[PDB]
Design a binder for this molecule. Structure first.
Ligand SMILES: Nc1ncnc2c1ncn2[C@@H]1O[C@H](COP(=O)(O)OP(=O)(O)OP(=O)(O)OP(=O)(O)OP(=O)(O)OC[C@H]2O[C@@H](n3cnc4c(N)ncnc43)[C@H](O)[C@@H]2O)[C@@H](O)[C@H]1O
Length: 218
């Protein structure tokens, strides 16, 4: 009834689609560094405006900023006492090493790192057709996962938007950055013994059953 885990995958693999499932099943805090940055943007803060430029170019925000953000949420957020799902963090080796140290000092080490494996060619179609409900994070897909009431949140009525970093230009840079900087983290968790791989090219419900299976709960 408690999990401390990391969700790793390329842009469009299905992290934001699966994290609700995990958060419902294990009652864990969902810590998504992308959503945290996007809330800074919506508040119009200075960190938000600087991060927006970097995100829209397909680059990565500084390790120092990202490590500080997570450290404060782990320390000051009460829901993180029940367990947590890290989504989009760590994203570089330095972030992974600093997380390892943090958790060692708190005495709450990671149990699992789930890699969502899916080929790049599929990811373009997923990113191109995405619509998000900006007031929650709810992602839909024009073809693959439609709003029943078009361009509207099926369960909350409000309009869906396109993310500003979801275009072919930014996406090419986001994929290259994933392969260069993030994918090395997978070997880090293989060596520590907590890695499990999942076929993320399957449909959502199939991927969710695969994840439950890989976690050792079901
Ligand atoms: N730690 C960090 N350090 C540095 N910089 C950081 C950082 N964290 C964040 N940043 C920065 O902030 C930016 C954004 O980060 P972030 O917002 O975390 O984005 P990302 O990692 O690029 O991931 P996505 O949100 O694009 O993908 P997803 O897998 O969650 O997709 P979804 O489930 O919607 O699915 C995609 C689409 O396909 C669909 N779909 C999902 N699953 C399936 C399926 N199985 N079959 C068919 N359709 C499916 C969905 O409906 C949707 O349409 C970064 O690029 C960087 O600038």
């Amino acid at each position: 009834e408690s999990i401390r885990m990391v969700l790793i995958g390329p842009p469009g693999a299905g992290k934001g689609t699966q994290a609700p499932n995990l958060q419902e099943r294990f009652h864990a805090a969902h810590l998504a560094t992308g959503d945290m940055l996007r809330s800074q943007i919506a508040k119009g803060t200075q960190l938000g405006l600087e991060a927006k430029k970097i995100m829209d170019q397909g680059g990565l925000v500084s390790d120092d900023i990202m490590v500080n953000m997570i450290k404060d949420e782990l320390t000051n957020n009460p829901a993180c006492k029940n367990g947590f799902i890290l989504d989009g963090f760590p994203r570089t080796i330095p972030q992974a090493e600093k997380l390892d140290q943090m958790l060692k000092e708190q005495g709450t080490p990671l149990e699992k790192a789930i890699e969502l494996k899916v080929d790049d060619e599929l990811l373009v179609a997923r990113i191109t057709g995405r619509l998000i409900h900006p007031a929650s994070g709810r992602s839909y897909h024009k073809i693959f996962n439609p709003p029943k009431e078009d361009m509207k949140d099926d369960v909350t009525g409000e309009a869906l938007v396109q993310r500003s970093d979801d275009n072919a230009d930014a996406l090419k840079k986001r994929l290259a950055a994933y392969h260069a900087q993030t994918e090395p983290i997978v070997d880090f968790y293989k060596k520590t013994g907590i890695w499990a791989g999942v076929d993320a090219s399957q449909p959502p419900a199939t991927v969710w059953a695969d994840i439950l299976n890989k976690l050792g709960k079901n």
